Coordinates of C-alpha atoms in Angstrom, one line a residue:
Chain A
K1 CA 26.0 227.3 -119.1
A2 CA 26.4 226.1 -122.7
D3 CA 23.9 225.7 -125.9
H4 CA 23.6 223.2 -128.6
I5 CA 22.2 222.8 -132.1
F6 CA 22.3 219.9 -134.6
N7 CA 20.6 221.4 -138.1
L8 CA 19.5 220.3 -141.5
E9 CA 19.2 222.4 -144.4
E10 CA 19.5 222.2 -148.0
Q11 CA 23.6 223.8 -147.8
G12 CA 23.6 220.5 -144.8
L13 CA 24.7 219.8 -141.2
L14 CA 25.3 223.0 -139.4
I15 CA 26.4 220.9 -136.7
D16 CA 27.6 222.7 -132.6
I17 CA 27.8 222.9 -129.2
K18 CA 28.9 225.6 -127.4
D19 CA 30.0 227.3 -124.2
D20 CA 30.4 231.3 -124.5
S21 CA 34.1 231.3 -124.7
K22 CA 34.6 227.9 -126.8
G23 CA 32.9 225.3 -129.1
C24 CA 33.3 222.8 -131.6
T25 CA 31.7 223.6 -135.0
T26 CA 31.2 220.8 -137.4
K27 CA 29.7 221.4 -140.8
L28 CA 28.5 219.0 -144.2
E29 CA 27.7 221.5 -146.3
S30 CA 26.3 220.4 -149.9
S31 CA 29.0 222.0 -151.6
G32 CA 32.0 219.2 -151.4
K33 CA 33.3 221.0 -148.1
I34 CA 33.7 219.2 -144.9
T35 CA 35.5 221.0 -141.6
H36 CA 35.5 221.0 -137.9
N37 CA 36.5 223.0 -135.6
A38 CA 37.3 223.4 -132.2
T39 CA 39.7 226.0 -129.9
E40 CA 41.8 223.2 -127.7
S41 CA 42.7 219.7 -129.7
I42 CA 42.1 217.2 -132.6
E43 CA 42.3 213.6 -131.7
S44 CA 41.8 210.5 -133.5
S45 CA 43.7 207.0 -132.8
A46 CA 42.4 203.4 -134.5
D47 CA 44.6 200.0 -134.4
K48 CA 45.3 199.3 -138.1
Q49 CA 45.3 202.5 -141.1
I50 CA 44.6 206.6 -141.1
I51 CA 44.7 207.1 -144.6
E52 CA 43.8 209.9 -147.1
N53 CA 43.6 209.6 -150.7
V54 CA 43.4 212.2 -153.5
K55 CA 44.0 210.5 -156.9
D56 CA 47.5 208.5 -156.0
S57 CA 48.5 211.8 -152.6
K58 CA 49.0 209.7 -149.2
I59 CA 49.7 209.7 -146.1
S60 CA 48.8 206.6 -144.5
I61 CA 49.8 205.2 -140.7
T62 CA 50.4 202.1 -140.1
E63 CA 51.5 200.5 -136.7
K64 CA 55.3 201.1 -137.6
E65 CA 55.4 202.9 -141.8
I66 CA 54.9 206.2 -142.6
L67 CA 54.1 206.8 -146.4
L68 CA 53.8 209.7 -146.9
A69 CA 53.6 209.0 -151.0
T70 CA 52.4 210.5 -154.2
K71 CA 53.8 209.3 -157.7
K72 CA 57.6 209.4 -158.1
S73 CA 57.7 210.9 -154.4
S74 CA 58.0 209.0 -151.4
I75 CA 59.1 209.8 -147.7
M76 CA 59.4 206.1 -146.2
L77 CA 59.3 206.9 -142.4
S78 CA 59.8 203.2 -141.6
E79 CA 61.5 202.0 -138.4
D80 CA 65.2 202.9 -138.1
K81 CA 65.6 203.0 -141.5
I82 CA 64.8 206.4 -143.6
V83 CA 63.9 206.4 -147.2
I84 CA 63.4 209.2 -148.8
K85 CA 63.6 208.6 -152.6
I86 CA 63.1 210.7 -156.7
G87 CA 64.3 208.0 -158.8
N88 CA 66.7 207.7 -158.7
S89 CA 68.4 208.9 -155.6
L90 CA 67.9 207.3 -152.3
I91 CA 69.1 208.5 -149.0
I92 CA 69.1 205.9 -146.1
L93 CA 69.1 207.4 -142.9
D94 CA 69.6 204.6 -141.1
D95 CA 71.4 203.6 -136.9
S96 CA 75.4 204.3 -138.4
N97 CA 74.4 204.1 -142.2
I98 CA 74.4 206.9 -144.4
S99 CA 74.2 206.6 -148.3
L100 CA 73.3 209.7 -150.3
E101 CA 72.9 207.6 -153.3
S102 CA 72.1 209.1 -156.7
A103 CA 73.7 209.9 -160.5
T104 CA 74.6 213.0 -159.5
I105 CA 75.8 215.6 -156.5
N106 CA 76.6 219.3 -156.5
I107 CA 77.4 220.7 -153.0
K108 CA 77.7 224.5 -152.6
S109 CA 78.4 226.4 -149.0
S110 CA 80.1 229.9 -149.1
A111 CA 82.0 230.0 -145.1
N112 CA 82.7 225.9 -144.2
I113 CA 82.8 222.6 -145.1
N114 CA 84.5 221.3 -141.9
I115 CA 84.1 217.0 -142.9
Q116 CA 85.8 215.7 -140.0
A117 CA 85.9 211.9 -139.3
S118 CA 87.4 209.3 -135.7
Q119 CA 89.0 206.5 -138.5
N120 CA 90.1 206.5 -142.2
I121 CA 88.6 208.6 -145.1
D122 CA 88.3 207.2 -148.7
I123 CA 87.9 208.6 -151.9
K124 CA 87.6 206.4 -154.4
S125 CA 87.8 208.1 -158.0
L126 CA 87.7 208.0 -162.0
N127 CA 89.8 210.6 -164.6
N128 CA 89.8 213.8 -162.4
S129 CA 89.7 214.5 -158.6
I130 CA 91.2 218.4 -158.8
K131 CA 91.4 221.3 -156.4
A132 CA 92.0 225.0 -156.9
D133 CA 93.4 228.2 -154.1
Chain B
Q1 CA -4.7 206.7 -125.4
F2 CA -4.4 206.7 -121.4
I3 CA -5.2 210.0 -120.3
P4 CA -6.1 210.1 -116.2
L5 CA -8.2 212.9 -115.4
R6 CA -5.9 215.2 -113.4
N7 CA -6.8 217.3 -110.5
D8 CA -8.8 220.8 -111.4
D9 CA -10.8 219.5 -114.0
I10 CA -14.6 220.3 -113.7
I11 CA -17.1 217.7 -114.4
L12 CA -20.9 217.1 -114.9
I13 CA -21.8 215.0 -112.6
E14 CA -24.8 212.8 -112.7
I15 CA -26.6 211.3 -110.0
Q16 CA -28.6 208.0 -111.4
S17 CA -29.6 206.6 -108.1
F18 CA -29.7 207.1 -104.9
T19 CA -25.7 206.2 -104.5
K20 CA -24.9 205.7 -108.2
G21 CA -23.2 208.6 -109.9
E22 CA -21.2 208.6 -113.1
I23 CA -19.9 211.0 -115.2
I24 CA -19.8 212.8 -118.3
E25 CA -18.6 215.7 -120.4
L26 CA -15.5 217.7 -119.2
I27 CA -15.9 220.9 -118.8
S28 CA -12.0 223.0 -118.8
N29 CA -8.8 222.8 -120.7
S30 CA -5.4 223.5 -120.4
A31 CA -3.9 224.5 -123.6
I32 CA -5.5 227.3 -125.8
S33 CA -4.1 231.1 -127.8
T34 CA -5.3 234.4 -126.4
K35 CA -5.1 235.9 -129.6
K36 CA -6.7 236.4 -132.4
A37 CA -6.6 233.8 -134.8
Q38 CA -5.5 235.3 -137.5
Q39 CA -1.5 235.3 -136.2
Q40 CA -1.4 232.0 -134.5
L41 CA -3.2 228.6 -134.8
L42 CA -2.1 226.5 -131.9
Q43 CA -2.6 222.7 -132.1
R44 CA -0.9 220.9 -129.0
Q45 CA -1.4 218.1 -126.2
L46 CA 0.5 219.6 -123.3
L47 CA 2.0 216.1 -121.1
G48 CA 2.5 215.4 -117.3
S49 CA 2.8 217.5 -113.7
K50 CA 3.9 221.2 -113.9
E51 CA 2.7 220.7 -118.2
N52 CA 6.6 221.4 -119.3
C53 CA 6.1 218.9 -122.9
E54 CA 3.9 220.9 -126.0
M55 CA 3.7 218.5 -129.6
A56 CA 3.2 222.1 -130.8
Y57 CA 2.3 222.4 -134.8
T58 CA 1.9 226.5 -134.1
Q59 CA 1.2 228.2 -137.7
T60 CA 1.4 231.4 -136.9
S61 CA 1.9 233.6 -140.4
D62 CA 5.5 233.5 -140.6
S63 CA 5.6 230.2 -140.6
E64 CA 4.5 226.3 -139.8
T65 CA 6.4 224.9 -137.2
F66 CA 6.7 221.8 -135.2
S67 CA 7.5 221.3 -132.1
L68 CA 8.7 218.8 -128.8
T69 CA 9.7 221.7 -126.6
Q70 CA 10.4 220.8 -122.6
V71 CA 10.6 223.3 -120.1
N72 CA 12.4 222.2 -117.1
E73 CA 14.4 224.2 -114.6
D74 CA 17.9 225.2 -116.9
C75 CA 17.3 221.9 -118.1
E76 CA 15.8 223.0 -121.8
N77 CA 14.9 220.7 -124.6
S78 CA 13.5 221.1 -127.8
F79 CA 12.9 219.7 -131.3
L80 CA 11.9 221.2 -134.0
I81 CA 10.5 221.7 -137.6
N82 CA 10.3 224.6 -139.9
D83 CA 9.5 224.9 -143.4
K84 CA 11.8 227.9 -143.8
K85 CA 14.9 226.0 -142.2
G86 CA 14.0 222.4 -141.4
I87 CA 14.6 219.8 -138.4
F88 CA 16.4 220.8 -135.3
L89 CA 17.1 219.4 -132.4
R90 CA 18.8 222.0 -129.4
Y91 CA 19.3 221.9 -125.8
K92 CA 19.5 224.6 -124.1
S93 CA 19.9 226.3 -120.5
Chain C
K1 CA 23.8 191.5 -133.0
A2 CA 25.2 195.1 -132.0
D3 CA 24.3 197.6 -129.6
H4 CA 24.5 202.0 -131.0
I5 CA 23.3 205.4 -129.2
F6 CA 23.6 208.8 -129.8
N7 CA 23.1 211.5 -127.1
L8 CA 23.6 215.5 -126.3
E9 CA 24.1 216.8 -123.5
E10 CA 25.7 219.4 -121.2
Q11 CA 29.0 218.2 -122.7
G12 CA 27.8 217.1 -126.0
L13 CA 27.9 214.1 -128.9
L14 CA 28.5 210.9 -127.6
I15 CA 28.2 208.5 -130.3
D16 CA 29.6 205.1 -130.8
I17 CA 28.1 201.9 -132.7
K18 CA 29.7 199.3 -131.0
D19 CA 29.9 195.4 -131.3
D20 CA 31.3 193.1 -128.5
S21 CA 34.7 193.4 -129.9
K22 CA 34.5 196.5 -132.0
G23 CA 33.2 200.0 -131.7
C24 CA 33.4 203.7 -133.6
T25 CA 32.9 206.0 -131.0
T26 CA 33.0 210.4 -131.8
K27 CA 32.7 212.8 -129.8
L28 CA 32.1 216.0 -129.9
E29 CA 32.5 217.7 -126.1
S30 CA 32.1 221.3 -125.3
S31 CA 35.9 221.9 -123.5
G32 CA 37.5 222.1 -127.2
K33 CA 37.5 218.6 -127.6
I34 CA 37.3 216.7 -131.1
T35 CA 37.6 213.4 -130.5
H36 CA 36.9 210.4 -132.6
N37 CA 38.0 206.0 -132.3
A38 CA 37.8 202.8 -134.1
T39 CA 39.4 199.6 -133.9
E40 CA 40.0 198.9 -137.4
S41 CA 40.9 202.1 -140.6
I42 CA 40.4 205.2 -141.1
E43 CA 40.3 206.9 -144.3
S44 CA 39.1 210.3 -146.2
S45 CA 39.6 211.0 -149.6
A46 CA 38.7 214.7 -151.4
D47 CA 39.0 216.2 -154.6
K48 CA 40.9 219.0 -153.9
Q49 CA 42.5 220.2 -150.5
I50 CA 43.0 218.2 -147.3
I51 CA 43.8 221.4 -145.3
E52 CA 45.0 221.7 -140.9
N53 CA 45.6 225.4 -139.9
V54 CA 47.1 226.1 -136.5
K55 CA 48.0 229.9 -136.9
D56 CA 50.6 228.9 -140.1
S57 CA 50.7 225.8 -139.6
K58 CA 50.0 223.5 -142.6
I59 CA 49.5 220.2 -143.7
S60 CA 48.2 220.1 -147.0
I61 CA 47.5 217.4 -149.9
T62 CA 46.7 219.0 -153.4
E63 CA 46.6 216.1 -156.2
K64 CA 50.2 217.4 -156.7
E65 CA 52.0 218.8 -154.0
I66 CA 52.4 218.1 -150.0
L67 CA 53.1 221.4 -147.9
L68 CA 54.5 220.6 -144.9
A69 CA 54.6 224.3 -143.9
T70 CA 55.1 226.5 -140.5
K71 CA 57.1 229.5 -140.5
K72 CA 60.5 229.8 -142.2
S73 CA 60.1 225.7 -142.9
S74 CA 58.6 224.1 -145.1
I75 CA 59.1 220.4 -147.2
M76 CA 57.7 220.8 -150.4
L77 CA 56.5 217.2 -151.8
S78 CA 55.4 218.0 -155.1
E79 CA 56.2 215.8 -157.7
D80 CA 59.3 215.0 -158.7
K81 CA 61.6 217.8 -157.0
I82 CA 61.7 217.2 -153.8
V83 CA 62.0 221.0 -151.2
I84 CA 63.2 221.1 -148.4
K85 CA 63.5 224.7 -146.8
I86 CA 65.0 226.7 -144.1
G87 CA 66.4 229.6 -145.3
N88 CA 68.8 229.4 -146.7
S89 CA 69.9 226.3 -147.5
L90 CA 68.0 224.1 -150.1
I91 CA 68.4 220.6 -151.0
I92 CA 66.5 219.9 -154.1
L93 CA 65.8 215.8 -154.8
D94 CA 65.5 215.4 -158.5
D95 CA 66.2 212.4 -160.7
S96 CA 69.1 213.3 -161.5
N97 CA 69.9 216.8 -159.5
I98 CA 70.5 216.9 -156.0
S99 CA 71.6 220.5 -154.5
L100 CA 73.1 220.6 -151.0
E101 CA 73.3 224.4 -150.8
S102 CA 73.5 226.7 -147.9
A103 CA 75.9 228.8 -146.4
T104 CA 77.7 226.2 -144.1
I105 CA 78.4 222.8 -144.2
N106 CA 80.0 221.2 -141.7
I107 CA 79.8 217.3 -142.0
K108 CA 80.8 214.6 -139.6
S109 CA 81.7 210.3 -139.3
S110 CA 83.6 208.1 -137.4
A111 CA 84.9 204.7 -140.0
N112 CA 84.4 205.9 -143.3
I113 CA 83.6 208.6 -145.9
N114 CA 82.4 206.8 -148.9
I115 CA 82.5 208.8 -152.1
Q116 CA 82.7 207.3 -155.1
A117 CA 81.8 208.3 -158.6
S118 CA 81.8 206.8 -162.5
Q119 CA 82.4 209.9 -164.3
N120 CA 84.9 212.8 -163.0
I121 CA 85.1 215.1 -159.9
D122 CA 85.7 218.3 -159.8
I123 CA 86.0 220.1 -156.2
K124 CA 86.7 223.7 -156.8
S125 CA 87.6 226.3 -154.3
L126 CA 89.7 229.7 -152.5
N127 CA 92.2 230.7 -150.0
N128 CA 92.3 227.1 -148.5
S129 CA 91.5 223.7 -149.1
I130 CA 93.9 221.4 -146.3
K131 CA 93.6 217.8 -145.2
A132 CA 95.6 215.3 -142.4
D133 CA 96.6 212.3 -141.3
Chain D
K1 CA 17.2 220.5 -155.9
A2 CA 19.4 218.1 -153.8
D3 CA 18.8 215.8 -151.0
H4 CA 19.6 214.0 -147.4
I5 CA 19.7 211.0 -145.7
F6 CA 20.4 210.5 -142.1
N7 CA 20.4 206.8 -141.1
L8 CA 20.6 204.1 -137.9
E9 CA 20.7 200.4 -138.9
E10 CA 22.6 197.1 -137.6
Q11 CA 25.7 198.6 -139.4
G12 CA 25.8 201.9 -138.9
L13 CA 25.6 206.0 -139.6
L14 CA 25.2 206.3 -143.2
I15 CA 24.9 210.2 -143.6
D16 CA 25.1 211.6 -146.9
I17 CA 24.1 214.9 -147.9
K18 CA 24.0 214.8 -151.9
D19 CA 23.2 217.5 -154.9
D20 CA 23.7 215.4 -158.2
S21 CA 26.8 216.1 -158.8
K22 CA 28.4 215.8 -155.4
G23 CA 27.7 215.2 -151.6
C24 CA 29.6 214.2 -148.6
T25 CA 29.2 210.7 -147.4
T26 CA 29.8 209.9 -143.8
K27 CA 29.9 206.3 -142.1
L28 CA 30.6 204.9 -139.0
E29 CA 30.1 200.8 -139.7
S30 CA 29.7 198.6 -136.7
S31 CA 33.9 196.5 -138.3
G32 CA 35.9 198.8 -136.8
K33 CA 35.7 201.9 -139.7
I34 CA 35.7 204.6 -140.6
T35 CA 35.6 206.5 -143.3
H36 CA 34.3 210.7 -144.4
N37 CA 34.6 211.3 -148.2
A38 CA 33.6 214.5 -150.8
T39 CA 33.7 215.9 -153.5
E40 CA 36.1 218.8 -152.7
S41 CA 38.1 219.4 -149.7
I42 CA 38.5 219.3 -146.2
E43 CA 39.7 221.4 -143.8
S44 CA 39.9 220.7 -140.3
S45 CA 41.2 223.7 -137.7
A46 CA 42.1 223.8 -134.2
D47 CA 43.7 226.0 -131.0
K48 CA 46.8 223.3 -129.6
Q49 CA 46.9 220.2 -131.2
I50 CA 45.4 217.4 -134.1
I51 CA 47.9 213.9 -132.8
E52 CA 46.6 210.6 -134.5
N53 CA 48.3 207.2 -132.3
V54 CA 48.2 203.8 -133.3
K55 CA 51.0 202.5 -130.7
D56 CA 53.6 205.3 -130.9
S57 CA 52.6 206.2 -135.0
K58 CA 52.3 210.1 -134.2
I59 CA 51.9 212.7 -136.4
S60 CA 50.9 215.6 -134.2
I61 CA 50.6 219.5 -134.8
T62 CA 51.5 222.2 -132.3
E63 CA 51.4 225.8 -133.1
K64 CA 55.1 225.8 -134.3
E65 CA 56.7 222.5 -134.4
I66 CA 55.4 219.0 -136.8
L67 CA 56.6 215.8 -134.9
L68 CA 56.2 212.7 -137.2
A69 CA 57.3 209.9 -135.3
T70 CA 57.1 206.0 -134.8
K71 CA 59.7 204.6 -132.3
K72 CA 63.8 205.8 -132.6
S73 CA 62.4 207.5 -136.4
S74 CA 61.2 211.5 -135.6
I75 CA 61.4 213.9 -138.2
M76 CA 60.3 217.2 -136.4
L77 CA 60.3 219.6 -138.5
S78 CA 60.0 222.3 -136.0
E79 CA 60.8 226.2 -136.2
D80 CA 63.5 226.8 -138.2
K81 CA 65.2 223.4 -137.2
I82 CA 64.6 220.7 -139.2
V83 CA 65.5 217.9 -136.4
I84 CA 65.7 214.6 -138.9
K85 CA 66.8 211.5 -136.0
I86 CA 67.9 207.2 -136.2
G87 CA 70.3 206.9 -133.2
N88 CA 72.3 207.5 -134.4
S89 CA 72.4 210.0 -137.6
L90 CA 71.1 213.8 -137.1
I91 CA 70.7 216.1 -139.9
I92 CA 70.0 219.5 -138.3
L93 CA 68.3 221.7 -141.1
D94 CA 68.8 225.4 -140.0
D95 CA 69.0 229.3 -141.4
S96 CA 73.6 228.3 -141.7
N97 CA 74.7 225.4 -140.2
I98 CA 73.9 222.0 -141.8
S99 CA 75.4 219.0 -140.5
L100 CA 75.1 215.9 -141.6
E101 CA 76.1 213.5 -138.0
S102 CA 76.0 209.4 -138.2
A103 CA 78.7 207.1 -137.3
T104 CA 79.3 206.0 -141.1
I105 CA 78.9 207.6 -144.4
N106 CA 78.5 206.2 -147.4
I107 CA 78.6 208.4 -150.9
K108 CA 77.9 206.8 -154.6
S109 CA 77.4 209.1 -157.4
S110 CA 77.6 208.8 -161.6
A111 CA 78.8 211.9 -163.4
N112 CA 79.8 214.3 -161.4
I113 CA 80.3 215.7 -156.9
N114 CA 80.2 219.0 -157.7
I115 CA 81.8 220.6 -154.0
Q116 CA 82.1 224.3 -154.5
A117 CA 82.9 227.4 -151.9
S118 CA 83.1 230.7 -151.4
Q119 CA 85.5 230.3 -148.4
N120 CA 87.9 228.4 -147.2
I121 CA 88.0 224.2 -146.8
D122 CA 88.6 222.1 -144.4
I123 CA 88.9 218.4 -144.6
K124 CA 90.1 217.2 -141.1
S125 CA 91.2 213.2 -140.6
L126 CA 92.9 210.8 -139.4
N127 CA 95.0 207.2 -140.7
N128 CA 94.3 207.0 -144.7
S129 CA 92.4 210.1 -146.3
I130 CA 93.5 208.3 -150.5
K131 CA 92.4 208.5 -154.3
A132 CA 92.3 206.8 -157.3
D133 CA 92.5 207.8 -161.4
Chain E
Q1 CA -5.0 218.0 -126.1
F2 CA -6.5 221.0 -128.8
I3 CA -8.2 220.9 -131.9
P4 CA -10.6 223.6 -132.5
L5 CA -13.4 223.4 -134.7
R6 CA -11.8 223.6 -138.2
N7 CA -14.3 224.7 -141.5
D8 CA -16.2 221.9 -143.6
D9 CA -17.3 219.7 -141.0
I10 CA -20.5 218.3 -140.7
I11 CA -22.1 218.3 -136.6
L12 CA -25.3 217.6 -135.0
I13 CA -26.4 220.6 -132.8
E14 CA -29.5 219.6 -130.6
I15 CA -31.9 223.9 -130.1
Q16 CA -32.3 222.5 -126.6
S17 CA -34.6 225.4 -126.1
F18 CA -36.0 228.8 -127.7
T19 CA -32.8 230.5 -128.3
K20 CA -30.5 227.4 -127.2
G21 CA -28.0 225.9 -129.5
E22 CA -25.8 223.2 -128.6
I23 CA -23.0 221.3 -130.4
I24 CA -22.8 217.0 -129.4
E25 CA -21.1 215.2 -132.6
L26 CA -19.1 215.1 -135.1
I27 CA -20.3 213.9 -139.2
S28 CA -17.2 214.0 -140.5
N29 CA -13.9 213.0 -141.1
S30 CA -10.7 213.6 -143.2
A31 CA -7.7 210.9 -142.6
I32 CA -9.3 207.2 -143.6
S33 CA -7.5 204.5 -146.1
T34 CA -8.8 203.4 -149.3
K35 CA -8.2 199.9 -149.5
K36 CA -8.9 196.6 -148.5
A37 CA -7.7 197.0 -144.7
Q38 CA -5.6 194.0 -146.2
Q39 CA -2.7 196.0 -147.7
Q40 CA -3.0 199.0 -145.5
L41 CA -3.3 200.0 -142.1
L42 CA -3.8 203.4 -141.0
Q43 CA -3.4 205.6 -138.3
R44 CA -2.5 209.2 -137.9
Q45 CA -2.9 212.3 -137.3
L46 CA -3.1 215.1 -140.1
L47 CA -2.9 219.0 -138.9
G48 CA -2.9 222.5 -139.2
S49 CA -4.2 224.4 -142.9
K50 CA -3.5 222.1 -145.7
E51 CA -3.8 219.1 -143.8
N52 CA 0.5 218.3 -144.3
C53 CA 2.2 216.5 -141.6
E54 CA 1.0 213.1 -141.0
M55 CA 1.2 210.5 -137.9
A56 CA 1.7 207.8 -139.2
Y57 CA 1.6 204.0 -138.4
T58 CA 1.5 203.0 -141.7
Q59 CA 2.0 198.9 -141.4
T60 CA 1.3 196.9 -144.7
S61 CA 2.3 194.0 -145.1
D62 CA 5.4 194.7 -146.0
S63 CA 6.6 196.3 -142.7
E64 CA 6.0 198.1 -139.7
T65 CA 6.9 202.7 -140.6
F66 CA 6.2 205.7 -138.7
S67 CA 6.3 208.9 -140.1
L68 CA 6.3 212.2 -139.1
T69 CA 5.9 213.9 -142.8
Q70 CA 6.1 217.1 -144.3
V71 CA 4.8 217.9 -147.6
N72 CA 5.0 221.5 -148.4
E73 CA 5.9 222.8 -152.3
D74 CA 9.7 221.8 -152.9
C75 CA 10.3 221.7 -148.9
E76 CA 9.5 217.7 -148.5
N77 CA 10.7 217.0 -144.6
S78 CA 10.3 213.7 -143.0
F79 CA 11.4 210.9 -140.0
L80 CA 10.9 207.7 -140.8
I81 CA 11.4 204.5 -137.9
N82 CA 11.6 201.0 -139.8
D83 CA 11.7 197.8 -138.1
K84 CA 14.1 196.3 -141.1
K85 CA 15.9 199.6 -141.1
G86 CA 15.1 202.0 -138.2
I87 CA 15.7 204.9 -137.9
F88 CA 15.8 207.8 -140.6
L89 CA 16.3 211.5 -140.7
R90 CA 15.7 212.8 -144.4
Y91 CA 14.9 216.7 -146.2
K92 CA 14.3 216.6 -150.2
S93 CA 13.1 218.5 -152.2

């Protein structure tokens, strides 16, 4: 009880597969535009790579490692090792090993900075380690 | 080509001798227009039983269209080529 | 030595290009579903935008700035300035400038909180700055 | 003033819709490869799901919740609740509630660790809480 | 089929009696080759006014091609099936 069209014009493919309520309307227009539309869902599976590139602006998907990268900036959602980079400030996120590397750190709050533990705490330093009230 | 003689066509038949009949010409059709030939220009076959497949080139005053349609009981296939619009492929119901 | 099909039915396009081992099977079914499949990889490049939208749920890609946004929530993977927002808690990640803004901060651990530096450290405060043992 | 091709060969669809400057070139080759190209932009909208899967390596998009997941590793860009997991180290990011859970924390710097507030600060502990100069 | 007699064809006409004329054969064409039949093998119709739609199967020494073309004033439709390359669909200008 549906209807189906498949065109070709000066502008490009205007392809739809439509029931009254639903449909799936894809184009390839000549203006450098690609569009796809649906009324429930889009799925797309592969086996090695799902890569999108606009002048070193990636989203890649391997079996294990998700890179979300541009120049100087790359979240690496690797297996068990989240790496979040701006040179030079790493934040490793592991099972039991969080580093927050940097050169400088500034931290603000307004109500609490609750810093608890279940074993010892060591704050090693140099020239100053100050406080106020 | 291979277009066998369907039923319900009307046919010239000589009787060339005692017990020799033959078939010469055909006097019938199944596809014409019924309009004044300033609005339609039909050029087409028909196909099979029910006559439901038209290889038509129906230039009207509007446009030059090519067509390969199918009329079945709610399966309505087509194929269209215009000059204003171009290559189509459709399924309807 | 391969085989190729291109359909149209009441349901929609069922398009595949198959060798014996491999293939590329795309649909556009009438049930609001779009699927694509392959046996090695999918790539897709452009020049300005790669945008996916379901009721303000974006993943956009410009030349420089990756937005991963819904309402009230937006990782901005900009060039050299990672911004991670929930109002009101920014985490800028720069070359040498990490802020962890918030209203409140709570921090837990179980073995160590090693806080080191290579220059001075300043912990400014108000009414309390407490400890235990 | 453009040109349009739609093929089928042993290798597969080689589909393009080209002006002189621009175009949209899609393939489905038989080597397990799917590619799409354009000269301005690609957009794709839906209503429920945009899911890509290579052996539990997801990028899904619902109305609200963006999952960026593999095994043991899942950024959940939920609405108002950013959750970044490696078991066991959560970083909730809320409106006014940042936790940095772990087992262990190590933190390095080189110039400053500026830790300020606008109300009280509590650093509860056990056996050690040390310093240096 | 339905191919009516166009203008500018030349036609055998008997005069079977006083005021009975009829039409028997056709003496004209509109589609041949002009080459030595070792380089071209044209098999085709022509269609409508302007003769701008060719259902041609032009096996040259190169290859066996099938075609459904359209020549209009800068709308240049086609349909091609080779053996080396296969199913094409084009729009040009």
